């Protein structure tokens, strides 16, 4: 429970490499910005309808304000694995939320 | 000056396609020259462009005429392929 | 009172032209996207400290997803008048909020 | 690998500058090679670059060491020139 910036990654499906990459992304954030950031992965295949509170922006723009290692993983997710639709960065309270190697639930 | 209605879907279904064609007809016969339907299949083409974005269906669905919203509510609740929408207001840069 | 996308413009000061431009921007939004959008102008000179719920992003990225006439005014605000720091686009409930020719309070 | 601490201020004041220099000293003598102070005056230079952004002071102020946060709380509450902050973690691309 804390108030931080949640990087929302919207993906359609996943591959073994994409899951590995997201876990690495999540690890880099918690290790480098212990609290300034947090990852939340949204798989549109599991939930076609987007929660009203959600919105999806193009990666190129926003991804430029993220740490360098993050821009790298993201670049591989959309360009190489092609599972990435877009993302969002939202300040929000985290605590009635879950924690697992793949970011927040 | 046209309103381009962008519909982001998670693939297609037999009915999903029935709803889309009727929607497109409803804009060509009822709101001629006011809307331009554009469907983007995400489960076919994930990668969002740079000027692109997908907003919440419940919000954009409100400024739309009652019939078009009916189909939208259908694609979101009935079929369940609708991820979200986008609404643009400008001069057509490739209306095909 | 409704739930829409609030384009937040963060500015430092204003000039007669910038105020005119913001009023025009506000008018275009309410007229073209009656409800899909809404403007909120934040003058950092009047409030140096940014409300915790606020964040400011670079214009070039985000401004690309806005209507064309909006990208134009914004371009004149930052490039020509130079009052524009950055912006944000946030979905939020509007109704315990005010209304005046300069967007929301 | 350095943490670049970006401080966006709305101009300066006599004390504001006293606090900044002490802060910069506190990072050069106490956390040598861990932080790199960078101040950006908005009331002097409004225009945000493209890779730039300004986040909420209360959030980023928490991951910072107690003394640096003390000054930050000072520039935000005492002086009142602090608009917000930004925190970067990377290899120095012009540390001057
Ligand atoms: Hg709306
Ligand atoms: Hg935080």
UniProtKB/Swiss-Prot annotation, chains A, C:
Changing residue 5 to A: Enhances KaiB(fs). Changing residue 38 to D: No longer binds KaiA or CikA. InterPro entries: Circ_KaiB, KaiB-like, KaiB_domain, Thioredoxin-like_sf. GO terms for biological process: circadian rhythm. Gene3D superfamilies: Glutaredoxin. Pfam families: KaiB (PF07689). Stable from pH 4.0 to 10. Changing residue 30 to A: No longer binds CikA. It comes from the Bacteria. Stable from 4 to 40 degrees Celsius. Keywords: Biological rhythms. Belongs to the KaiB family. HAMAP family: KaiB. Has 2 forms, fold switches to a thioredoxin-like fold (KaiB(fs)) when bound to KaiC, KaiA or CikA. The KaiB(fs) form binds faster to KaiC than its alternate form, so less fully phosphorylated KaiC forms; the KaiB(fs) form activates signaling through CikA and inhibits signaling through SasA. The C-terminal region may confer species specificity; C-terminal hybrids do not all rescue deletions in S.elongatus PCC 7942. Key component of the KaiABC oscillator complex, which constitutes the main circadian regulator in cyanobacteria. Its composition changes during the circadian cycle to control KaiC phosphorylation. KaiA stimulates KaiC autophosphorylation, while KaiB sequesters KaiA, leading to KaiC autodephosphorylation. KaiA binding to KaiC yields KaiA(2-4):KaiC(6) complexes which stimulate KaiC autophosphorylation. Phospho-Ser-431 KaiC accumulation triggers binding of KaiB to form the KaiB(6):KaiC(6) complex, leading to changes in the output regulators CikA and SasA. PANTHER family: CIRCADIAN CLOCK PROTEIN KAIB2 (PTHR41709:SF2), KAIB-LIKE PROTEIN 1 (PTHR41709). Undergoes a major conformational rearrangment; in the free state forms homotetramers with 2 dimers. When bound to the CI domain of KaiC, KaiA or CikA switches to a monomeric thioredoxin-fold (KaiB(fs)). The KaiABC complex composition changes during the circadian cycle to control KaiC phosphorylation. Complexes KaiC(6), KaiA(2-4):KaiC(6), KaiB(6):KaiC(6) and KaiC(6):KaiB(6):KaiA(12) are among the most important forms, many form cooperatively. Binds to KaiA; 1 KaiB(fs) binds to the KaiA homodimer. Binds to the B-loop in the CI domain of KaiC; SasA and KaiB compete to bind to the CI domain. This is Circadian clock oscillator protein KaiB.
UniProtKB/Swiss-Prot annotation, chains B, D:
Stable from pH 4.0 to 10. Changing residue 36 to D: No longer binds KaiA or CikA. It holds the Pfam family KaiB. Stable from 4 to 40 degrees Celsius. SUPFAM superfamilies: Thioredoxin-like. One of its GO terms (biological process) is circadian rhythm. Changing residue 24 to A: Increases binding to CikA. Keywords: Biological rhythms. Disulfide bonds: none annotated. Changing residue 38 to E: No longer binds KaiA or CikA. Belongs to the KaiB family. Undergoes a major conformational rearrangment; in the free state forms homotetramers with 2 dimers. When bound to the CI domain of KaiC, KaiA or CikA switches to a monomeric thioredoxin-fold (KaiB(fs)). The KaiABC complex composition changes during the circadian cycle to control KaiC phosphorylation. Complexes KaiC(6), KaiA(2-4):KaiC(6), KaiB(6):KaiC(6) and KaiC(6):KaiB(6):KaiA(12) are among the most important forms, many form cooperatively. Binds to KaiA; 1 KaiB(fs) binds to the KaiA homodimer. Binds to the B-loop in the CI domain of KaiC; SasA and KaiB compete to bind to the CI domain. PANTHER family: CIRCADIAN CLOCK PROTEIN KAIB2 (PTHR41709:SF2), KAIB-LIKE PROTEIN 1 (PTHR41709). Key component of the KaiABC oscillator complex, which constitutes the main circadian regulator in cyanobacteria. Its composition changes during the circadian cycle to control KaiC phosphorylation. KaiA stimulates KaiC autophosphorylation, while KaiB sequesters KaiA, leading to KaiC autodephosphorylation. KaiA binding to KaiC yields KaiA(2-4):KaiC(6) complexes which stimulate KaiC autophosphorylation. Phospho-Ser-431 KaiC accumulation triggers binding of KaiB to form the KaiB(6):KaiC(6) complex, leading to changes in the output regulators CikA and SasA. A metamorphic protein which reversibly switches between an inactive tetrameric fold and a rare, thioredoxin-like monomeric fold (KaiB(fs)). KaiB(fs) binds phospho-KaiC, KaiA and CikA. KaiA and CikA compete for binding to KaiB(fs), and KaiB(fs) and SasA compete for binding to KaiC, thus the clock oscillator and output signal pathway are tightly coupled. Has 2 forms, fold switches to a thioredoxin-like fold (KaiB(fs)) when bound to KaiC, KaiA or CikA. The KaiB(fs) form binds faster to KaiC than its alternate form, so less fully phosphorylated KaiC forms; the KaiB(fs) form activates signaling through CikA and inhibits signaling through SasA. The C-terminal region may confer species specificity; C-terminal hybrids do not all rescue deletions in S.elongatus PCC 7942. This is Circadian clock oscillator protein KaiB.
